[PDB]
């Protein structure tokens, strides 16, 4: 009887399906920084605020990095393979992951720009950190972003929507919809899309990007 | 060893086979890519008749290119091409010599015919004209658009003088910025420089 009961446990159907009344529309996340809320404060780190000067942006860029690294956390941004849609022979993704505001990465090619993040081993991402500069890079500012998820390039699937209006700072996105029990994302394949820029732009930069995961002597 | 004229020998290639053989911006690049693939395919798939034919030097690729219906040296000048019947060909083989064992050796590592390998290894011409959309555009709001006007002008110092509206702006290519020179009540129509960029001769709308 042990075989029969475990089979029910692996695949509960009558217990699981409540009404099967899903709305099936894609949920959209609001990123605006003019409204103060507890949920927004959790995802927006730098704080709600004329347009600051670029050096002020560089200063807040470092303070955002320090605050994100201040908490107990493990950075594995360099523990994965990256393959953007196309280069421009001026700046590879290294200057995007160099944690420097002055340097940045630029793609050049088709309008739906793609950024690939491949992982070697099953890593459980909890917080994804991305930095935007609306006033500094208004021409190449990312306006709409769609984040995918999957275990392979084969099974990439939609996760979340992100609309950009005015965000001149680091953006933190912890994942809770997928798994409420773990409060983290478990995947080996993450890809990002930038289908259109602000004011009908063509290309897109990426100032910063980071990935966050949880975990006498003789010299 | 030489076939008679009145009684020619028949090659294995058939009437319609020659009908097959003789059949023929990124668009130019793709068309060139398609043609070499087609020529290579018909060269490799055929050529057993061509290998049995020929008398000396030359190549099966040259025979196919000669069929009517940076360049390297052509070997021989024969343009016989495909043919149903051959007169000169009577079955004969040269004795094996050290060059032949050298040749059969460089062939041992080749999955295709040496002639096809030479055709592929030959470099295609990289001769194209690129006149496409501009690679850089800067800012110059409110530019004059009168038929009797000629505003922009090159200078040897990577310096451009523009009459934007009623003020003269300076664009430096080495810096990529805009510098304002002066302005007046009447709009400018013509711009010029005297010497080596030392002076700027500008014409107004009233002479």
């Amino acid at each position: 009887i042990g075989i029969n009961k475990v089979l029910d446990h692996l695949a509960p159907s009558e217990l699981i399906k409540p009404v099967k009344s899903c709305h099936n529309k894609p949920s959209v996340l609001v990123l605006d920084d003019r409204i103060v809320d507890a949920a927004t404060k959790d995802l927006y780190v730098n704080g709600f605020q004329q347009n600051p000067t670029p050096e002020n942006l560089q200063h807040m860029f470092h303070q955002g990095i320090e605050i994100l690294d201040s908490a107990r956390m493990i950075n594995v941004t360099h523990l994965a393979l990256w393959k953007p849609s196309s280069f421009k022979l001026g700046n590879p993704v290294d200057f995007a992951l160099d944690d420097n505001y002055d340097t940045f990465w630029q793609s050049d090619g088709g309008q739906p720009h793609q950024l690939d993040i491949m992982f070697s081993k099953r890593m459980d991402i909890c917080v994804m950190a991305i930095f935007f500069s609306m006033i500094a890079d208004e021409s190449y500012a990312p306006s709409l972003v769609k984040v995918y998820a999957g275990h392979s390039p084969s099974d990439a699937r939609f996760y979340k929507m992100l609309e950009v209006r005015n965000v001149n700072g680091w953006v933190a996105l912890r994942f809770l919809d997928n798994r409420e029990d773990d409060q983290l994302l478990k995947c080996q394949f993450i890809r990002l899309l930038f289908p259109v820029n602000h004011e009908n732009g063509k290309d897109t930069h990426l100032r910063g990007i980071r990935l966050y995961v949880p975990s006498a002597i003789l010299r | 060893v030489y076939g008679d004229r009145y009684i020619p020998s028949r090659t294995d290639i058939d009437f319609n086979s020659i009908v097959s053989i003789s059949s023929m911006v990124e668009y130019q690049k793709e068309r060139q890519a398609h043609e070499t693939y087609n020529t290579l395919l018909k060269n490799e798939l055929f050529g057993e008749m061509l290998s049995k034919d020929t008398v000396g030097s030359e190549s099966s690729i040259d025979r196919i290119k000669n069929t009517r219906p940076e360049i390297t040296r052509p070997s021989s000048n024969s343009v016989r091409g495909a043919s149903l019947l051959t007169y000169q060909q009577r079955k004969g083989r040269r004795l094996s010599a050290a060059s032949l064992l050298q040749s059969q050796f460089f062939d041992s590592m080749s999955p295709v015919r040496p002639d096809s390998k030479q055709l592929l290894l030959s470099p295609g011409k990289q001769f194209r004209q690129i006149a496409k959309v501009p690679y850089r555009v800067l800012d110059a709001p409110s530019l004059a658009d009168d038929f009797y006007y000629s505003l922009i002008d090159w200078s040897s110092t990577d310096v451009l003088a523009v009459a934007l509206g009623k003020s003269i702006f300076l664009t430096d290519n080495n810096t990529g910025d805009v510098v304002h020179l002066c302005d007046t009540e009447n709009e400018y129509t013509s711009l010029s420089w005297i010497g080596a960029g030392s002076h700027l001769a500008v014409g107004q709308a009233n002479g």
Binding site: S139, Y140, N197, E199, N200, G201, K202, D203 | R136, V137, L138, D139
Partner: peptide, 6 residues
């Protein structure tokens, strides 16, 4: 500025 719109 580039990024010229149609």
């Amino acid at each position: 500025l580039s990024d010229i719109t149609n």
